[PDB]
From Swiss-Prot:
SMART domains: GuKc. It comes from Mus musculus (Mouse). Catalyzes the phosphorylation of GMP to GDP. Essential enzyme for recycling GMP and indirectly, cyclic GMP (cGMP). Involved in the cGMP metabolism in photoreceptors. This is Guanylate kinase. Keywords: ATP-binding, Cytoplasm, Kinase, Mitochondrion, Nucleotide-binding, Transferase. InterPro entries: GK/Ca_channel_bsu, Guanylate_kin-like_dom, Guanylate_kinase, Guanylate_kinase_CS, P-loop_NTPase. GO terms for cellular component: cytosol; mitochondrion; photoreceptor inner segment. It comes from the Eukaryota. The active site is at R40, R133, R144. Its EC number is 2.7.4.8.
C-alpha cells in the first residue's frame, strides 16, 4: 500500500522522508514528481524532482502522462504515471509528497494509499522554519504561508487524512510516522 504525505510547505515532509529512506531504502521508493520551479541548492534532478519547463509539462499532461498535476505557489507540479510505475515495478512501497490538490486528485485514482498530514506546531513556527531554511523569495513565502493557512483546514476535513502528525519534536514525529507504517515495514520484512 503506497503512502501519501501532505501538509504545508515547511512542515517537515522532506526531512521526515529523508530519515525514512536512509533507514528503509529496501522497502520504500520515492515518487519523483515533475516541477517547473527552480532547483534549490542540494536538490538533484531525477532525485528530488524532474525539473522541467511549464511547456513540456503541459504537453505531457495533455498527452495523458500524469496521474495528477497542480499549480502551487506560482509553479506547476505533478505525479507522472511512470514515476509511480517505476517504484512499483521494483517491488517497493511507493511514497508520494504532494499538496492538498494532489491528495484530492489521488483519492479518485486506483493508487489507494494511506494519507498522512504533517502539521507544524503552529503557523508562526511554520513561518519561522520556512524563512530559516531560506530557499524561497519573499513572494514565494507569501504564497506558501497563505496556502498553509488555507490548507490547514484539511487536516480536519472528515475522512480526508488517515493520520495527522505534528512535527514539533522531529524524533517524536519520525517515530510516529514509522509506527503508522509498522505493518508495511514488518510485512516487507524490514
Ligand atoms: N522538528 C523540526 N524542528 C525544527 N526544524 C525542523 C524540524 N523538521 C524539519 N525542520 C527544518 O524545517 C525546514 C522545513 O522542513 P522540510 O522538511 O524541508 O519541509 P517540507 O519538505 O515539508 O517543505 C527545514 O529547514 C528543516 O530542516
Ligand atoms: N499535487 C502535487 N503537489 C506536489 C507534487 N510535488 C510536490 N508537490 C507539493 O507542492 C508543494 C511545494 O513543494 P516544494 O516547492 O516546497 O518542493 C508541497 O505541498 C508539495 O507537497 C506533485 O507531484 N503533485
Ligand atoms: K513530490
Amino acid at each position: 500500500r503506497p503512502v501519501v504525505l501532505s501538509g504545508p510547505s515547511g512542515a517537515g515532509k522532506s526531512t521526515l522522508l529523508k530519515k525514512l529512506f536512509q533507514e528503509h531504502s529496501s522497502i520504500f521508493g520515492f515518487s519523483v514528481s515533475h516541477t517547473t520551479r527552480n532547483p534549490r541548492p542540494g536538490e538533484e534532478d531525477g532525485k528530488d524532482y524532474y525539473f522541467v519547463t511549464r511547456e513540456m509539462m503541459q504537453r505531457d499532461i495533455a498527452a495523458g502522462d500524469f496521474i495528477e498535476h497542480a499549480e502551487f505557489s506560482g509553479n506547476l507540479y505533478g505525479t507522472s504515471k511512470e514515476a509511480v510505475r517505476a517504484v512499483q515495478a521494483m517491488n517497493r512501497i511507493c511514497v508520494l509528497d504532494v499538496d492538498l490538490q494532489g491528495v484530492r486528485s489521488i483519492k479518485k485514482t486506483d493508487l489507494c494509499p494511506i494519507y498522512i498530514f504533517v502539521q507544524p506546531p503552529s503557523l508562526d513556527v511554520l513561518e519561522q522554519r520556512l524563512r530559516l531554511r531560506n530557499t524561497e523569495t519573499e513572494e514565494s513565502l507569501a504564497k506558501r504561508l497563505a496556502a498553509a493557512r488555507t490548507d490547514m483546514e484539511s487536516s480536519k476535513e472528515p475522512g480526508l487524512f488517515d493520520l495527522v502528525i505534528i512535527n514539533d519534536d522531529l524524533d517524536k514525529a519520525y517515530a510516529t510516522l514509522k509506527q503508522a507504517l509498522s505493518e508495511e515495514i514488518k510485512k516487507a520484512q524490514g
